[PDB]
Amino acid sequence: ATLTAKNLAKAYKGRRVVEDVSLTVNSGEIVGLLGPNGAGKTTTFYMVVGIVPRDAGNIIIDDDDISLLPLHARARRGIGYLPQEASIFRRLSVYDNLMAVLQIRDDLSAEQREDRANELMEEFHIEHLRDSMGQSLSGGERRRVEIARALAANPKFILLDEPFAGVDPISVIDIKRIIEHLRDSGLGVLITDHNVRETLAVCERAYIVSQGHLIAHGTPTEILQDEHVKRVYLGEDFRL
């Protein structure tokens, strides 16, 4: 499949926080939306996922324009989303968190739902936390349950808003291998980050945003031909 956002634009109280941001993620790809803080990354995600409405632009998946469809409708069309902050249910166990979203899987019965729940706990290495409350999980364990909870909805595209935020240096390399696994499974992965040097390497293509505008895009090799981006990458310039 193909998820495409074309020239999105969003404004809050007269201030246009996102002028013109465009991106495209295909199945079997890891596309990045990189840029400094306050550039418009999260606002772009809310427009693609459908949390906040769009002022201008289009959100298209394959031959369907889903720009005026609410969140739940785009969720049933293949879009999965994970926030930057903690989105786990802290008062429920890991098993109860996965069975939560599996309750919307009408394509499965009560037996297959609990089957996939065990399949998702072995895949993300959280079998030893089946009955553990979400509050007792560390930063890295919380994310892997949060990601597996999104995968339980069986999406076509998974959108991670800075997934490496608030996790130990051993969990980032753990989530990075989880991302490369989802890509090989046919999903389209879309991640955001402010660290451009560390995240650009795993991106087949990336879209560099700055103050609501798109300053560069393409594969990392094509992006790192923009002199302004090379300076921030090599360390010659401070602000991107």
Ligand X SMILES: Nc1ncnc2c1ncn2[C@@H]1O[C@H](COP(=O)(O)OP(=O)(O)O)[C@@H](O)[C@H]1O
Show the site string, 14-43: x = touches ligand X by CB under 6 A, - = not: ---x-------------------xxxxxxx
Largest CA distance in the chain: 58
Judged by beta carbon distances under 5 to 8 A according to partner kind, the member of ligand CZJ, Mg ion, ligand X, none in contact with residue 89 is ligand CZJ
- Answer yes or no: is 235 a known binding residue: no
150, 119, 145: which is closest to 131 by C-alpha? 145
Number of residues that bind ligand X (CB under 6 A): 9
Query: What is the smallest separation between the CB atom of 43 and ligand X, expressed in angstroms?
Result: 4
Which phi-psi region, left, alpha or beta, contains residue 36 (left: φ > 0; alpha: ψ -120 to 50)?
beta
Rounded Cα distance, 74 and 206, in Å: 23
Residues 6+ apart with CB under 8 A from 97: 88, 89, 134, 145, 149
Judged by beta carbon distances under 5 to 8 A according to partner kind, the member of ligand CZJ, ligand X, Mg ion, none in contact with residue 103 is ligand CZJ
Q: Report residue 103 as tokens.
A: 């309750």
Number of residues that bind ligand CZJ (CB under 6 A): 8
Show the site string, 42-71: x = touches ligand X by CB under 6 A, - = not: xx----------------------------
Length of the chain: 240
Position among 15, 37, 63, 91 found at the interface with ligand CZJ (CB under 6 A) = 91
- DSSP element (H, E) containing 199: helix 196-199
For binding to ligand CZJ (CB under 6 A), which residues are involved? Answer: 89-92, 96, 99-100, 103
For binding to ligand X (CB under 6 A), which residues are involved? Answer: 12, 17, 37-43
